[PDB]
Design a protein around this ligand. Structure first.
Ligand SMILES: [Zn+2]
Ligand SMILES: [Zn+2]
Lengths: 65, 65
């Protein structure tokens, strides 16, 4: 052990907050009526949602970044 | 019409949320136990990568979940 760097602690806390936000958005859109698909985003790994027969949506890529 | 989320969906959501919480907890622990964060995400799953003290690269999601 040496202590994690301050960099590593910020990135870990960021990564935490991000994932929390992604779960919260996915939940929001499921509640708003979006369909969960059995596929994940090829870019970021996030489970994909579908809005009727209008579109497929990644809450990460297409909203949070 | 709008339709609720299904039993399936809200299960997968709770699961994804648990996964992500565990990834963060695992990542943190490895950081505190001597593993250094890489500026790079797992190509399979998107998770930030670590290296151990023998410079093996290590994805907590892939190689422990
Ligand atoms: Zn994505
Ligand atoms: Zn991985």
């Amino acid at each position: 052990w040496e202590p994690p760097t301050e960099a590593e602690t910020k990135v870990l806390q960021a990564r935490r907050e991000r994932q929390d936000r992604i779960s919260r958005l996915m939940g929001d859109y499921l509640l708003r009526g979006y369909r969960m698909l059995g596929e994940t985003c090829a870019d970021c790994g996030t489970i994909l949602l579908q809005d009727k027969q209008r579109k497929i949506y990644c809450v990460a890529c297409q909203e949070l970044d």
